Ligand binder design. Sequence first.
Ligand SMILES: COC(=O)c1c(Cc2ccc(S(=O)(=O)CCO)cc2)c(=O)c2ccc(F)cc2n1-c1ccccc1
Lengths: 322, 9
Amino acid sequence: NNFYSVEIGDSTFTVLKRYQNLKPIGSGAQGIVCAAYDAILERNVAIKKLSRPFQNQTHAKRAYRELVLMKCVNHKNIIGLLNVFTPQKSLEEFQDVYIVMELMDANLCQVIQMELDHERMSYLLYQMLCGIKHLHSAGIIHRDLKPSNIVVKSDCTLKILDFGLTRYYRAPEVILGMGYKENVDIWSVGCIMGEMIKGGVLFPGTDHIDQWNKVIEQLGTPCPEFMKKLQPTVRTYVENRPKYAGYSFEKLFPDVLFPLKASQARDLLSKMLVIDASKRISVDEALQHPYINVWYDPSEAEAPPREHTIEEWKELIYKEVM
Amino acid sequence: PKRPTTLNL
Ligand SMILES: COC(=O)c1c(Cc2ccc(S(=O)(=O)CCO)cc2)c(=O)c2ccc(F)cc2n1-c1ccccc1
């Protein structure tokens, strides 16, 4: 009686009456997403209906982790949780979970090819890095940052969409099979910043092996010390790839592409787009970089931080909804 | 500088 149903494609969305005018806005493997107006809050929201949450243990563990993390992370530069509900009345009937989140206006896909100025560019990046820093402080390393999972509003505010784990934006540590740390996410910020500037994808590798080629062509074969850190097998390949000296950052990003600021933009990129993670700039040091630091505000850029049966997962998820 | 309040969609 508190619920009503709307058909969205092949999907039936049964939601609380407060949510009105549902229309689909996209999908992932993790379910269909509708935009809706929350009458009670008087604002637009995203409603995500979870795809087969306890179909199996892999799905169940994913749904559970997503839910718990969403309840613990809270920051203006990360998509927040507004509500969680199920239309089923008991554990035995329990089938569906709905997640109500903040709605923005677009993802970055389009925004980044519409050339921006230094103020808007640096400000968006600043917001990205605050969101990232906050994720890291909650012990979350994203690893899959890309323009499709970064959303913006027409007032120039920006939010990271999800908690991550197109191959174009993944760090060398991930591409190859290395370990990783916090600044893995900085590689992605470099690729996105890079795109915004040159108008197109920095490393548009047509597969995982081509992806590598794209990088060394433009940045230059990494040092022999880096080469060591690799496995037996992949090191063989990487080390047997033809030496490239790569191009300087002046050639990779000339003045022609920019509207002193151009000079700093380039300097930041040269510190972000560095194959060897042990020499790549960090998140803190990037928030402090001259190009980004103009916007600083410690309330934004500093804010304080096993195995089950399907039947058990169902119970834990149901309790997390209640 | 003032923070941008507009972004062309
Ligand atoms: C493609 O969708 C997204 O990128 C997306 C946006 C950006 C967006 C796009 C279109 C509208 S609109 O169409 O309502 C225009 C409003 O006037 C609003 C917001 C969001 O703001 C957004 C917010 C929350 C969410 F959990 C998913 C979201 N998605 C999204 C991403 C991947 C898959 C499914 C949905």
